[PDB]
C-alpha cells in the first residue's frame, strides 16, 4: 500500500493501512514523510508499542533533511540513496535495474543499444560531480531519463525491426534516437546552449553506426595512450562481464574531462575526511 504524506486524508489512510497490515502482514510505504515531522514522532511511538505480523514491513521514503526526528532514525534502519560512486557502479546499477528479459529480445542489436545507453547515462550522470566543468549546472539526470530513453530505444527498434532476429547496424534508427535524446529525454532539462552542444556531441559520438565495429572507442586516451575499448559482445551477459572487469582506476578523463578536474575536489574531500575523523576523537 503506497501513501503520499501531506494531507489529513493521507494521515488517516496511512493509519488505517498500518493497522490493517500489522494484522494481515502486507507491506506499507509512506512517501515524503519528511513533510510531516510532527506526525513522524507519533508514528514512532505507535510503532514502538506494536507486535505486528512476521511478514509486515513499513517503508518510509524521505529526503535527507534535519526535520526528520532523531528517535525515528534510531527506531528504523536507514538506507541512503544517491548517485553511484563511479561509472562502473552506475553501469552495474543500470544493468541490474533493467530486467534481463527486456534486454534479451527479438533483435540481437538491442543488447548493444542498451549497453550504449548505460554507458551514455553513466558518463552524463558522473560528469555532474564536476558541476562547473562537466556541465553548467546540477541537472537532475536520473532514473526517469534512463527509463524514457529505454522506452524510446525499444519503440524505435521494434518499429524498424519487425521481429527479425538480426538488424543491420546501418538500419538502426540512429537519427531518431539521437534527436529524441537531444530534444525530449535528456535535452529537456538542458537550458544552456553549450550544455546542449555537449549533449549533442556525446550523442553523435556514441550513437552511430561505427559503435558496432570492433575498433570503436568508448573513450580516447584515458591516460598516456591507453583508452577504453568497446566490447565485442552481442549479448547482455557479455556486456555485464565487461562492465564488471573495469580497471577501477577511474579518472575524469573517462568522462572527457581533463585529469586535473578532480584535484581540488579530491584535496577538499581528503581534508574533510581528516576533519571528520578528528571531530570524533
Amino acid at each position: 500500500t503506497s501513501i503520499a504524506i501531506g494531507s489529513a486524508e493521507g494521515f488517516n489512510q496511512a493509519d488505517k493501512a498500518i493497522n490493517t497490515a500489522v494484522k494481515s502482514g502486507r507491506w506499507v510505504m509512506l512517501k515524503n514523510v519528511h513533510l510531516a515531522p510532527g506526525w513522524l514522532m507519533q508514528l514512532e511511538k505507535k510503532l514502538h508499542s506494536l507486535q505486528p505480523h512476521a511478514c509486515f514491513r513499513l517503508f518510509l521514503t524521505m529526503e535527507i533533511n534535519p526535520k526528520v526526528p532523531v528517535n525515528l532514525l534510531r527506531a528504523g534502519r536507514i538506507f541512503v540513496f544517491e548517485p553511484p560512486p563511479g561509472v562502473k557502479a552506475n553501469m552495474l546499477r543500470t544493468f541490474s535495474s533493467i530486467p534481463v528479459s527486456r534486454i534479451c529480445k527479438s533483435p540481437n542489436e538491442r543488447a548493444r543499444l542498451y549497453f550504449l545507453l548505460a554507458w551514455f547515462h553513466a558518463i552524463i550522470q558522473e560528469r555532474l560531480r564536476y558541476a562547473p566543468l562537466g556541465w553548467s549546472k546540477k541537472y537532475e539526470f536520473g532514473e526517469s531519463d534512463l527509463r524514457s530513453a529505454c522506452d524510446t530505444v525499444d519503440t524505435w527498434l521494434d518499429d524498424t525491426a519487425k521481429g527479425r532476429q538480426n538488424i543491420s547496424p546501418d538500419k538502426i534508427p540512429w537519427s531518431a534516437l539521437k534527436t529524441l535524446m537531444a530534444q525530449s529525454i535528456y535535452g529537456g532539462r538542458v537550458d544552456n546552449e553549450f550544455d546542449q552542444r555537449l549533449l549533442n556531441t556525446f550523442l553523435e559520438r556514441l550513437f552511430t553506426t561505427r559503435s558496432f565495429d570492433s575498433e570503436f572507442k568508448l573513450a580516447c586516451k584515458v591516460d598516456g595512450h591507453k583508452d577504453i575499448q568497446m566490447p565485442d559482445g552481442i549479448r547482455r551477459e557479455e556486456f555485464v562481464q565487461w562492465v564488471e572487469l573495469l580497471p577501477d582506476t577511474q579518472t575524469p578523463s573517462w568522462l572527457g574531462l581533463p585529469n586535473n578536474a578532480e584535484r581540488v575536489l579530491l584535496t577538499t574531500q581528503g581534508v574533510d575526511m581528516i576533519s571528520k575523523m578528528l571531530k570524533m576523537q
Partner: protein
C-alpha cells in the same frame, strides 16, 4: 435592489423544485419549506398584480421586511442543495467547470433557454451561445464569442429530448460530428486548391469565408502534409527528380495570395482567418525548405517523422476518427471541440521542441512540465498544442489554497470531460499538497496506461480510477500539464515522486525575431523582416543600456504588445487615409496606399505608446537616441487629443486641480494622464508606479471623469487595498468540511460586474488596487492579466474578465513584485517632478477660496487669508525655500513633501477658524484687514516652523527658525537669543512668547505626582497648542519620541480642552491586526444603513471618537515590508472608510479619527512607517524634558510634597537636584544597549515623587535623615530592582550614596543610609523603616500561618527573600500594580507571590494549562478573572508563567488587559449581556446607580484596574526578553520588573 434579487432567485429555485422529480425524495424538508415560501411569493405577486402602481405596492405593510425575509430564506435553501448539485454534475461532465450559483441558474432555467446563453462559455472551449429557431425548441447550431457560428448537420430538437442533460449531450455530439463533416468538405476543396500552379484569389477567399477559422488552418495543414507525403513517396526510389520543389512552390504561391489578401481591407473575421493561414503557411514553407536542403528522399526519415503530420482518411466510417495527427511516434485523434477563433502562435523552433517533448510525454501517458522564465510562452505553447489536437484546454492559476480536495475535484472534472489541464505556477502549492496530489496524478496516469493497452476493448468495463474515494471514468483524451518558474525561490519545490510523473522541458529563450517577423508579415507589413531585425535588437538595447528599474520589462510580452499595437496603428492609418481620400477627391487604391506607407514610424509610434510611459525622466532621451540609431531619419509626433484635453481641463477646474499644456505648470501631469489613457486603451492591466504624492490617484480619477463626460459612458471605480485584508478575504476561501465557497472582495466585485444585475457591463469599471504588491496576492491575478483574461478559483470556478473592466494597481514601488506580474501590466511612471509644489499650492489656495471651512463670512475670511498668503505660496517663495531647507535637516521620521504641506494647510485652516472665532466674539468690531494681514503673515511663519520641523530636535527647530529669519520679510521677534519656535502668534496679530502661557503653579498636596496633574512647561504649552490645532480639523496625527517623554500626557491634556471628543486607548504589539480596530469599532460604534451606504459612527451622538494607538510602529512587517494594520489605517484615512469582510460592503467612517504614538523607528522592534501613511499624518517629536524642565516639573512636585512636613520645606531644592542628578546618571549609565529593559524616563521620577509622598503622608514629623532614607529606598526600588549584573547594583548603591552626600552635606551617614534599607507597613500601621530581625520574625510567624491555612511547603528566610517579599508587597499595594518577576525556575517567584497575595488578602489565580488548552479556554479564564475582580469586587493576584503562553493571542489579550484594564472583544454576545447584568448588581451593591451600558463598562474597567493584579514570572533569557519587549510592550512599561535571578 431587494425585489430583483428575490425574483431572480425564486425563478430558478422554482424551476429546479418543479422540473426535477427526484428532489422530493432526496431533500423533502426544504422542498416543503420552499413550497411554503413560494406560496408566500405567489400571494405577494397576486397582491402586486391587483394594483400594478408602484406607490400602492410601496405602501404594503412590512413589504421591506417581507422581501428581506424572502431573500434570507431563499439563500438558506440555495445553500442547502450541494448534494443535488453534485448529482447533476455527475450526469453531464461539463457541469464540473461551472459555479454553484451558475449551476443553480442553469438547472432552474432549463425550460427558458434564453438565460443560458451566458453560461456556455464556461463549459465549452469556444461555444459562447447556441442558435435556436424562433420557437426555441430545436438547436440549429452554435456560435463563438467573435460571432462565428457553426450550423449543425442534424439540428438537436429539445422537444424530443426534454431533459437538460440529454439535449446538452446531443448538442455536444452534433457539434463534434458537424465539425468533422465540415472539415471533410474543406479538405475536399483545399485538395483542389492544392497541387495547382496558380490560385485564383476570388475562389480562395470564398473558401476561406465558407469555413471556420479552426477548419481552414486544419485543411491547409492536411493538404500540405498529404502533398509532402506523396512527394517523398515518389522520391523513395533514390536519386530521383524532386517534386518537393513543386510543393514548396505551391506553398509560396498560396502565401503570396494570402499576403496580397491581407494587404487590402478585409472583414475582421476574414482578417483573422488570413492571419492564421499566413502564420501556418510560413511554418509550412520553412519546414519544406528544411526538408529540401537536407536532401530527404524517404517518407520514413526522422527529419520528416519529427514534424507534425496530418492524415485524412475519407474511407473511415467514424467521422471523428477520420483525421489522425502524428508527430514522431505519437499518434493523436482530433477532438473536434469547437475552439472558435483563437490567436495562433508563431511555430518557432522552441514551440517545435515544445510540441515534440509534450507529444512524447503524452504518448508515454505522463504529463508535460515545461519550465523557464516568464514570457517564454510556456503556457501559450501548451494551449496551442491542445488547440492543434482539437482539445478542450482549461487553464488554472494554481495557488497555495489549491489543496488536495480541490485539486482532486478538478482532476475528476478533467477525467470525466476528457479535457486538458494546464496548471500554471504548479509550484505555488504547498509541498505537502504537491506530494498528496502526486498520488492522484499517478492513479490517473495508471488508468490511462491500462486504457492504452491493446488487450482492453471499449465494449468491456470502462476505465476508472480512484479519485477522492470514488470511481471516476478516465477519458483517453485527458492530459495534465504543469507550467512553473523554477527560478522563483519562494515557489515550493516538487517531490521526486511527483517530478518523475512529468516530462520536463526548458523554455528559456523564445525566438523573438521569428515571432516578430511572422507577426508583422501576417499583419500586412511590407519589409517585415527588416522591421523585425530592427525591433528585436532595439528591445535588447532597451533592456541592456537603459537604467535598471523594478518596473521595466522588455521581454516577449512587451514586443508582442508592440506588434499588436503596430498592426492596430497601421489599420487606423489606413482608415484615416481612406477617409481623407473620401473627403478630397474620389480615387482610392489600397495597393498604392499600402505601398507608400511609413511602416517604420508606425512601429516607432507603437513603441512610444508602450515603452515611453514607463520611462523615468533620465531614460527618455536615451530611448529616443536608441530610436534614432536603430530607425534613422524617422520621427514620431504624439497625437493632439484636444477632445480629451478640454474634458481634462473641465474636470481639473471642477476638482481644483492645475492643468497645463506642454511646458506650462502642470503640463507633465497632463502628459502622464494622456499616457495612462493610452495604456488603458491598449491594455487591460495597468500599474501606476511612482513615489508617494506623484499625482497617480488624481490622474486616474480625472481620467475617469473626463472619459465619462466625453464618451458618455459612466465610470465606476472600485478601490481595494489588497494588503489591508488577508488573502482569504481578498480572493475568497473554501470550507474544508462543507466545500462551500465564500467570495472574497475582488472576487465578489468581479462576479457582481460579470452578472450585470444592474447593468455593470455598460459602465466603464476600473478595479484599482491601491496598496502594496507582493507575490502572494498578485500572482493569483496572473491568469487575469494574461490573454486568458480569466480568474480561476480553487473550487474550479473560472470568471472571465469583461472587456470593459480594467485591473489597475496604484503603487509607490515594485521592489517586491516579480517579473511575472511586471511583464503582465502596462506601466505609467509618475515621478515626483510630475507633481510640482506649485500645483499643490494652487490646489490649496483654490480650495481655500472656494470650499467653506465651517461647512458667507467664513468664506470671505478664507478668501482674504488666501489673498494675504498668495505672495508666500509661489515658486521661490518663503514656503518653497523653507521646504527645500527643511529637507536638508534630519527628522525623527523620513520627511515627505506632502506631510509637511498637509500639516501647514491644516494649521492655516486653523488660523482662518481663529479669525472667524475672533469675528464672532467681537460682532461690534470685526477684525480689520491690517490686523488680518499681520496675523496671517505671523501665523504662516509659525505654521511653517511647526510643520517643517515638528519631528526634529530643538537644535534643528532653531536652525530652521534661523534660516527663516535669514530669508523671510515678515516681521519677527527681536529676541537676541530666543528662537522663533518659542513664540506664538496672538490673535491681535503680534508675536508673544510662550513663557507667558507657562505659570509657576502650586499643585495641591493630595494631587502630588497624579497622572492627571501636569506641570506647565514651554514644551507642554507648545505641544498642547500644536495638538489642539491638528485635532481641531480631525486630522490624524502621530506623536514620536522616547518612552515616558510625555506623548500620552500631552495628548490627554490637549484633549481636555476639547469636550466634544472622547478617546479610546489601543495598544499595538507585534501581533496587532486590523481585528483589534474592528473590535474597538464594534464595541464603541455601530453600523447603520444610510441611503448613500453603510456608515460607521460612534454610539454617542455629537461626539468624535479619537482612537489612540499607543505603539503604532510595533506591528510586524511581513516578508514584503507591509504592516496590515498600518495599511488599514491608511485606507480609512485616505478613503475615509474600509471594507466589511462579512458582506464585502464599503463602510464609511463618520465622527472617527486616529491619534498615533510611537518610539523612534531606530529603536529596537520599531519599523519605519510607510511613506503613503506618513503623508496624511503629521508627526511631532516629544523629546525627554531637559534638566531644567525636569528640575521645574519635579521641583513643583517636591514643594507640594514637602508641605506636609513644615520642617522639611527647606529641602525641596536639594532633594529635587539629587533626584534629577541621580536619574540623569542612571539613564546615561544603563542604556538599552546593555539590556532591553534598561529604559529610564521621567516616569521613574514621577514614581519616585509618588512613593516619597506616600511614605511621608501619614508621618506627623520627620527629620532630614529619614527623608534621605526614604529617598534612597525609592531610588533603590526604582533603579536597582531591574538590574541584572551585581556590578550594576554596586554602582547604583555607591552613586546613591555619592549623590546623597553631594546634595546633603550636613547630615550623618549611618542613621540615614545604613545599607539594609527596608520599609514595610507590616509591623506597624505606617510605612516606617523596619529592621531585618523583627521583619524576619514576623515573616516566620506569618509563614507558619500560611502553612497551616494555605500551601504547605517549608521555606528559608534569607535576606533576599525578605527583600523580594517586601518588593512584592509594595507592588500589590498599588492600583493597576502588575509584576514581572524574572529568575530561574525554583527560585521562589510563584511561592513568594502566593505568600504575599495571602498576606495582602489577594486571591491567587493561575490558569490550569493542559495539552488541549486553546485560545478559547484562555478567553474563558480571562472572563472569569474579570468578572470576579470587576463585578464582585475581589482582589485577585493573577499569577501567570511564560510556560502558560501557548499562543500569541494569549500575549495580545494580556497586553490589552495590562495596558487598558479591559479587553474590548472579550465580552460579546450573551457574554456581554450577562456581564452588564452582573455589573448592574455590582454597582447597586457598591451604591452607584448606573443606567446605560457605557458607564457600566467604565465602572467595570475602573474596578478591574483597582482590583486585578497580574504577576508574570519568566526565565531570564537573552533573546526571549527582547522578543517579549516587542510582542508585549505592556510587560515593560506597565509592569514593575524585579530581577530575582538565580540565588546568589
Amino acid at each position: 435592489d431587494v425585489w430583483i434579487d428575490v425574483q431572480r432567485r425564486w425563478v430558478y429555485l422554482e424551476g429546479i423544485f418543479t422540473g426535477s422529480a427526484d428532489i422530493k425524495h432526496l431533500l423533502p424538508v426544504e422542498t416543503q419549506r420552499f413550497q411554503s415560501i413560494s406560496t408566500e411569493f405567489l400571494a405577494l405577486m397576486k397582491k402586486v398584480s391587483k394594483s400594478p402602481l408602484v406607490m400602492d405596492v410601496l405602501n404594503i405593510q412590512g413589504v421591506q421586511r417581507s422581501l428581506e425575509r424572502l431573500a434570507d430564506l431563499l439563500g438558506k435553501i440555495q445553500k442547502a442543495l450541494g448534494e443535488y448539485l453534485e448529482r447533476e454534475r455527475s450526469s453531464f461532465p461539463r457541469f464540473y467547470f461551472v459555479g454553484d450559483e451558475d449551476l443553480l441558474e442553469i438547472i432552474g432555467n432549463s425550460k427558458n433557454v434564453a438565460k443560458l446563453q451566458k453560461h456556455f462559455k464556461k463549459m465549452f472551449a469556444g461555444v459562447s451561445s447556441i442558435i435556436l429557431n424562433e420557437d426555441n425548441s430545436v438547436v440549429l447550431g452554435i456560435s463563438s464569442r467573435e460571432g462565428e457560428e457553426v450550423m449543425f448537420k442534424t439540428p438537436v430538437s429539445i422537444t424530443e429530448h426534454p431533459k437538460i442533460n440529454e439535449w446538452l449531450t446531443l448538442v455536444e455530439k452534433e457539434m463534434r460530428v458537424t465539425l468533422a463533416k465540415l472539415l471533410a468538405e474543406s479538405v475536399t476543396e483545399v485538395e483542389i486548391f492544392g497541387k495547382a500552379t496558380s490560385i485564383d484569389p476570388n475562389t480562395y477567399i470564398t473558401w476561406i469565408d465558407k469555413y471556420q477559422a479552426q477548419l481552414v488552418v486544419l485543411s491547409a495543414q492536411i493538404a500540405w502534409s498529404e502533398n509532402v507525403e506523396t512527394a517523398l513517396s515518389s522520391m523513395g526510389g533514390g536519386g530521383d527528380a524532386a517534386p518537393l520543389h513543386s510543393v514548396l512552390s505551391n506553398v509560396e504561391v498560396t502565401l503570396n495570395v494570402l499576403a496580397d489578401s491581407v494587404l487590402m481591407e478585409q472583414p475582421p473575421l476574414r482578417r483573422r482567418k488570413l492571419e492564421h493561414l499566413i502564420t501556418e503557411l510560413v511554418h509550412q514553407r520553412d519546414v519544406t525548405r528544411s526538408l529540401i536542403k537536407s536532401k530527404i528522399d524517404n517518407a520514413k526519415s526522422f527529419e520528416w517523422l519529427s514534424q507534425m503530420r496530418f492524415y485524412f482518411d475519407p474511407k473511415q466510417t467514424d467521422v471523428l476518427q477520420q483525421l489522425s495527427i502524428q508527430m514522431a511516434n505519437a499518434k493523436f485523434n482530433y477532438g473536434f471541440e469547437y475552439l472558435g477563433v483563437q490567436d495562433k502562435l508563431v511555430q518557432t523552433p522552441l514551440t517545435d521542441r515544445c510540441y515534440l517533448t509534450m507529444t512524447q510525454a503524452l504518448e508515454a501517458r505522463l504529463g508535460g512540465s515545461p519550465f523557464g522564465p516568464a514570457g517564454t510562452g510556456k503556457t501559450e505553447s501548451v494551449k496551442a498544442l491542445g488547440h492543434q489536437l482539437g482539445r478542450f484546454v482549461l487553464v488554472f492559476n494554481c495557488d497555495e489554497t489549491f489543496d488536495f480536495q480541490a485539486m482532486g475535484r478538478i482532476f475528476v472534472g478533467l477525467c470525466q470531460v476528457g479535457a486538458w489541464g494546464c496548471f500554471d505556477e504548479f509550484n505555488r502549492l504547498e509541498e505537502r499538497m504537491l506530494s498528496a496530489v502526486s498520488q492522484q496524478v499517478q492513479c490517473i496516469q495508471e488508468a490511462l496506461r491500462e486504457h492504452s493497452n491493446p488487450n482492453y476493448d471499449k465494449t468491456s468495463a470502462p476505465i476508472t480510477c480512484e479519485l477522492l474515494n470514488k470511481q471516476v471514468k478516465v477519458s483517453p483524451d485527458m492530459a495534465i500539464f504543469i507550467t512553473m518558474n523554477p527560478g522563483y525561490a519562494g515557489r515550493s519545490n516538487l517531490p521526486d515522486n511527483l517530478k518523475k510523473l512529468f516530462r520536463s522541458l526548458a523554455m528559456t529563450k523564445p525566438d523573438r525575431q521569428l515571432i516578430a517577423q511572422v507577426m508583422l508579415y501576417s499583419q500586412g507589413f511590407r519589409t517585415a523582416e527588416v522591421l523585425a531585425n530592427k525591433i528585436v535588437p532595439f528591445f535588447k538595447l532597451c533592456d541592456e543600456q537603459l537604467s535598471s528599474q523594478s518596473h521595466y520589462d522588455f521581454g516577449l510580452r512587451a514586443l508582442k504588445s508592440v506588434l499588436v499595437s503596430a498592426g492596430n496603428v497601421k489599420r487606423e492609418r489606413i482608415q484615416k487615409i481612406k477617409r481623407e481620400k473620401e473627403e478630397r477627391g474620389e480615387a482610392v487604391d489600397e495597393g498604392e496606399i499600402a505601398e507608400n506607407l511609413p511602416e517604420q514610424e508606425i512601429l516607432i509610434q507603437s513603441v512610444c505608446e508602450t515603452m515611453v510611459p514607463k520611462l523615468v525622466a533620465e531614460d527618455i532621451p536615451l530611448l529616443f537616441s536608441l530610436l534614432s540609431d536603430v530607425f534613422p531619419g524617422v520621427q514620431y509626433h504624439r497625437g493632439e487629443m484636444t477632445a480629451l484635453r478640454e474634458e481634462l481641463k473641465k474636470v481639473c477646474q471642477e476638482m481644483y486641480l492645475t492643468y497645463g499644456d506642454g511646458e506650462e505648470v502642470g503640463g507633465m501631469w497632463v502628459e502622464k494622464v494622456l499616457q495612462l489613457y493610452q495604456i488603458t486603451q491598449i491594455n487591460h492591466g495597468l500599474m501606476m508606479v511612482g513615489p508617494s504624492g506623484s499625482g497617480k490617484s488624481m490622474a486616474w480619477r480625472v481620467l475617469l471623469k473626463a472619459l465619462e463626460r466625453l464618451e458618455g459612458v459612466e465610470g465606476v471605480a472600485h478601490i481595494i487595498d489588497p494588503k489591508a485584508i488577508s488573502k482569504d478575504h481578498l480572493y475568497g476561501t473554501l470550507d474544508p468540511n462543507t466545500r462551500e465557497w465564500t467570495d472574497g472582495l475582488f472576487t465578489h466585485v468581479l462576479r457582481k460586474i460579470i452578472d450585470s444585475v444592474r447593468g455593470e457591463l455598460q459602465k466603464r469599471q476600473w478595479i484599482v488596487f491601491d496598496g502594496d504588491v507582493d507575490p502572494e496576492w498578485v500572482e493569483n491575478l496572473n491568469s487575469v492579466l494574461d490573454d486568458n483574461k480569466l480568474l480561476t478559483l480553487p473550487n474550479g470556478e473560472r470568471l472571465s474578465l469583461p472587456p470593459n473592466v480594467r485591473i489597475m494597481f496604484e503603487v509607490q514601488d515594485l521592489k517586491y513584485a516579480t517579473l511575472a506580474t511586471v511583464s503582465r501590466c502596462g506601466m505609467v511612471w509618475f515621478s515626483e517632478d510630475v507633481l510640482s509644489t506649485d500645483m499643490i499650492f494652487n490646489n490649496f489656495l483654490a480650495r481655500l477660496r472656494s470650499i467653506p471651512l465651517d461647512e458667507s463670512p467664513m468664506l470671505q475670511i478664507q478668501r482674504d487669508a488666501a489673498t494675504i498668503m498668495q505672495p508666500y505660496f509661489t515658486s521661490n517663495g518663503l514656503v518653497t525655500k523653507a521646504l527645500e531647507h527643511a529637507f536638508q535637516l534630519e527628522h525623527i521620521m523620513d520627511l515627505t513633501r506632502l506631510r509637511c504641506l498637509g500639516s501647514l494647510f491644516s494649521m492655516l485652516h486653523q488660523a482662518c477658524r481663529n479669525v472667524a472665532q475672533y469675528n464672532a466674539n467681537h460682532p461690534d468690531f470685526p477684525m480689520q484687514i491690517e490686523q488680518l494681514e499681520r496675523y496671517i503673515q505671523r501665523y504662516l511663519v509659525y505654521a511653517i516652523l511647526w510643520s517643517l520641523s515638528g519631528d526634529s530636535r530643538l537644535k534643528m527647530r532653531a536652525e530652521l527658525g534661523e534660516y527663516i529669519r535669514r530669508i523671510t520679510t515678515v516681521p519677527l521677534p527681536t529676541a537676541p537669543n530666543i528662537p522663533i519656535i518659542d513664540y506664538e502668534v496672538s490673535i491681535s496679530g503680534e508675536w508673544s512668547p510662550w513663557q507667558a502661557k507657562v505659570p509657576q503653579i502650586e499643585v495641591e498636596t493630595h494631587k502630588v505626582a497624579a497622572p492627571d496633574v501636569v506641570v506647565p512647561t514651554l514644551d507642554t504649552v507648545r505641544h498642547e497648542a500644536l495638538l489642539y490645532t491638528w485635532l481641531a480639523e480631525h486630522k490624524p496625527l502621530v506623536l514620536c519620541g522616547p518612552p515616558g517623554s510625555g506623548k500620552t500626557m500631552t495628548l490627554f491634556s490637549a484633549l481636555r480642552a476639547l469636550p466634544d471628543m472622547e478617546v479610546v486607548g489601543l495598544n499595538f504589539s507585534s501581533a496587532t491586526t486590523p481585528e483589534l480596530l474592528l473590535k474597538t469599532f464594534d464595541h464603541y460604534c455601530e453600523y447603520r444603513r444610510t441611503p448613500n451606504g453603510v456608515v460607521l459612527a460612534p454610539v454617542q451622538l455629537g461626539k468624535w471618537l479619537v482612537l489612540f494607538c499607543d505603539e503604532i510602529n510595533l506591528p510586524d512587517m511581513d516578508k514584503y515590508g507591509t504592516q496590515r494594520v498600518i495599511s488599514f489605517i491608511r485606507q480609512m484615512v485616505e478613503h475615509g472608510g474600509f471594507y466589511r469582510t462579512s458582506d464585502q460592503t464599503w463602510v464609511k467612517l463618520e465622527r472617527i479619527q486616529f491619534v498615533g504614538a510611537c518610539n523612534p523607528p531606530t529603536d529596537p522592534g520599531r519599523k519605519p512607517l510607510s511613506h503613503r501613511f506618513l503623508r496624511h499624518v503629521p508627526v511631532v517629536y516629544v523629546d525627554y524634558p531637559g534638566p531644567a524642565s525636569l528640575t521645574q516639573i519635579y521641583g513643583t512636585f517636591n514643594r507640594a510634597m514637602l508641605r506636609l512636613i513644615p520642617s522639611l520645606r527647606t529641602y525641596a531644592e536639594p532633594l529635587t537636584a539629587a533626584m534629577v542628578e541621580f536619574y540623569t546618571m542612571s539613564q546615561e549609565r544603563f542604556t538599552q544597549d546593555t539590556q532591553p529593559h534598561y529604559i529610564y524616563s521621567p516616569r521613574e521620577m514621577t514614581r519616585w515623587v509618588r512613593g516619597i509622598f506616600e511614605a511621608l503622608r501619614p508621618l506627623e514629623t520627620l527629620p532630614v535623615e529619614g527623608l534621605i532614607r526614604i529617598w534612597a529606598h525609592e531610588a533603590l526600588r526604582l533603579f536597582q530592582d531591574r538590574l541584572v549584573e551585581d556590578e550594576e547594583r554596586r554602582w547604583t548603591d555607591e552613586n546613591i550614596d555619592t549623590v546623597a552626600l553631594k546634595h546633603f552635606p550636613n547630615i550623618d551617614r549611618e542613621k540615614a543610609m545604613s545599607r539594609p534599607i527596608l520599609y514595610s507597613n507590616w509591623l506597624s500601621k505606617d510605612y516606617i523603616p523596619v529592621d531585618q530581625e523583627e521583619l524576619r520574625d514576623y515573616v516566620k510567624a506569618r509563614l507558619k500561618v500560611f502553612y497551616e491555612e494555605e500551601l504547605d511547603v517549608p521555606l528559608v528566610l534569607f535576606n533576599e527573600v525578605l527583600d523580594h517579599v517586601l518588593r512584592i508587597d509594595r507592588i500589590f499595594r498599588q492600583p493597576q500594580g502588575h509584576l514581572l518577576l524574572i529568575g530561574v525556575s525554583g527560585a521562589g517567584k510563584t511561592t513568594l507571590s502566593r505568600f504575599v497575595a495571602w498576606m495582602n488578602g489577594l486571591s491567587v489565580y493561575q490558569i490550569k494549562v493542559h495539552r488541549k488548552y486553546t485560545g478559547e479556554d484562555f478567553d474563558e479564564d480571562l472572563r472569569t478573572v474579570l468578572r470576579r475582580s470587576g463585578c464582585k469586587n475581589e482582589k485577585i493576584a493573577f499569577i501567570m508563567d511564560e510556560s502558560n503562553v501557548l499562543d500569541s493571542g494569549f500575549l495580545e489579550r494580556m497586553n490589552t488587559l495590562l495596558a487598558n484594564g479591559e479587553v474590548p472583544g472579550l465580552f460579546e454576545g450573551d457574554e456581554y449581556a450577562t456581564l452588564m447584568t452582573q455589573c448592574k448588581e455590582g454597582a447597586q451593591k457598591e451604591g452607584l446607580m448606573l443606567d446605560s451600558h457605557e458607564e457600566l463598562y467604565k465602572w467595570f474597567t475602573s474596578q478591574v484596574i483597582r482590583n486585578l493584579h497580574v504577576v508574570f514570572t519568566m526565565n531570564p533569557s537573552s533573546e526571549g526578553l527582547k522578543d517579549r519587549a516587542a510582542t508585549s510592550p505592556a510587560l515593560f512599561n506597565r509592569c514593575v520588573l524585579n530581577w530575582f535571578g538565580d540565588w546568589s
